Design a protein around this ligand. Sequence first.
Ligand code: 2YO
Ligand code: 2YO
Ligand code: CL
Ligand code: CL
Ligand code: ZN
Ligand code: ZN
Lengths: 364, 364
Amino acid sequence: RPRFSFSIAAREGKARTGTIEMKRGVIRTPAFMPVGTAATVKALKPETVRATGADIILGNTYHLMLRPGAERIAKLGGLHSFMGWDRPILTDSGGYQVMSLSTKQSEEGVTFKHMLSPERSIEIQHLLGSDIVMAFDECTPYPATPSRAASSMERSMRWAKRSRDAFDSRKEQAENAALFGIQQGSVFENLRQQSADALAEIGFDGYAVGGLAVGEGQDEMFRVLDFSVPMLPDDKPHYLMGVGKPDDIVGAVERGIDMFDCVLPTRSGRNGQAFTWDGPINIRNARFSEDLKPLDSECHCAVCQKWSRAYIHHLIRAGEILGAMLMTEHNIAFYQQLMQKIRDSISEGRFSQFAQDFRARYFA
Amino acid sequence: RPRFSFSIAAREGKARTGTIEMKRGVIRTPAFMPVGTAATVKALKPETVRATGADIILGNTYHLMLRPGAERIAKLGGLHSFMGWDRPILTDSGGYQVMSLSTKQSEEGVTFKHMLSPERSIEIQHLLGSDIVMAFDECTPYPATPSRAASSMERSMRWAKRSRDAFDSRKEQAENAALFGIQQGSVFENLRQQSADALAEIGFDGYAVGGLAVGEGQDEMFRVLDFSVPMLPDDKPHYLMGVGKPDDIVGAVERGIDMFDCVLPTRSGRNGQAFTWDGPINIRNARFSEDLKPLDSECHCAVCQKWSRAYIHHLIRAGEILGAMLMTEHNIAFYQQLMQKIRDSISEGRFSQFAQDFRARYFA
Ligand SMILES: O=c1nc[nH]c2cc3[nH]c(NCCN4CCCCC4)nc3cc12
Ligand SMILES: O=c1nc[nH]c2cc3[nH]c(NCCN4CCCCC4)nc3cc12
Ligand SMILES: [Cl-]
Ligand SMILES: [Cl-]
Ligand SMILES: [Zn+2]
Ligand SMILES: [Zn+2]
């Protein structure tokens, strides 16, 4: 099997559909990655994650590098063996959550209550046995002045080069894994261009659009994607970090994005929000107490084949673990079915119509 | 399929092994019943409960009669349909937990902050669609004076007759379900005898030993079982309510018990205690942080086929739902494997040796 091979099978406008072949499996694009926090996709066995259609998961690095620790996970055989997921894992750099969850910044890296640098991040992801490694970057806060956005983006580009060099120095990592760079530049077109130029000069297997989904709102996010994604190499995957709601995903695919990760389906699941083709519902609402219909009328997932809204309503109101399990499996399956419909409609040259039909019904 | 047919295939001393055939399935005895609280075996899908080997589950009635309510569950198609378990369900009467979790007692029944009577209990269990219905009784507190134990037991016997009559008056229930009576009498042999006599005079499909596992300790529980179980009809199942730890179960089978229920494997599971053939372990203990062995070296369950102690240690310490899921599935599977070994050893006339071997290793 190849280390990393991206093939585009079909296009419609800026939207693409295709495959990434890697040693541990094939990734169908556009792809949604369920998020594994602390080496688990919350409330799901890996076999259930796979049953929903997921080809790849995102492994958060931040918690794992603290406990059990990256060296310990490597001693235990790597993250794949540890958690029982044998397909590709994309690991984040650890830095985003350092800024969010724990700090002193410098050119070397970030110190926090430990020092995380581009080199240490790459080594940690190596020890975990990551298939897709993210360059260590800085997510510029929103809003930012042009000067602050510029200095931040430039530091990220220097860190991108350091990430590239550290990755390339580790033969086994370079042979078996892939490395993605992350574009910054806030909402500023000229800075996004400078960032894309820098990343392309270094060269990566894929390119993420960073610095978005940080409070700017969908209109602004879409505006920035409009000019930012075409700046990236067309022949490599485009990854939008931390996105998003179903409508965010459809619009981002319309703008050339191939990969997504988001905690929404899992987090929402546990909190009682189920995604349906007619929009989200809160299953705790009294209107579902005697509703024998499945969560969604069309959904192919095992939860909708077997249990009613009324039962899941009861479980979530009772605080039962099975409620979290069933809601999460359905929500992840819904996201995967959304990605499948996106892939099929692009392949068939009817994605524009699908996007329109999806929105009309989802927001009715 | 028959409504209720108990067949004893083999005996060794007071121990029996056999089958109960019912309309929704066969129950292999001695049997362990996982407990479903609020219409779920906590942290397990019904398919997983079945995969562990369970033939029947216990449905607590107390919470369900409050929310969603018995009438509501009946409107939704009954408990089996509601929770997705299509095999036999034994329901308790609701009264034990009324005394434990919420009271004014009278000859009519128990009032609590609702009135629960033998007639109302039987009707609630009917509405849930129970396969094995428990007579409504009073669990005498321990310790009790002989006079208090006597008056309590006598009230329970009057309630047993009322339970019998209410059950028999409902044609569909009498045709499709079974009814068990519950022996009381505290630790007093003469009262246990009077209770057994009363229950046999009324006639039930099975007989529970009530009033035990309420603080008396194993030595005393075994002493009471020694004389109490032979008082019950030999040709019907014997059910020990709320028992217990693995060694409690082995000793109770040695004394003629055929059926068990206990929250221990599920509750312990969530709290980090795993049962093994070498005794219980607390998976949170630091000694398991790098232990790549399964929870138990011989266990056939899916958890022990795939995940390490180290991973489950990590999950439970992180408060992850998957930790509760995996611990619970293993513990229920362990209990079922214990029951299978008990059944096989009685069938083969080597149960005495099994009990000795089990204890020597479990308590080493
Ligand atoms: O620029 C980034 N570099 C590295 N990692 C990132 C992660 C991100 N995550 C988000 N947004 C997360 C949005 N999410 C929505 C659901 C609720 C929790 C927050 N933007 C990001 C940008 C970056
Ligand atoms: O005499 C009884 N009548 C009706 N229901 C019962 C339920 C019982 N449950 C117990 N003991 C429960 C022990 N269990 C052990 C694990 C932790 C929670 C308590 N004795 C019981 C007697 C009775
Ligand atoms: Cl997110
Ligand atoms: Cl119990
Ligand atoms: Zn579904
Ligand atoms: Zn096991």
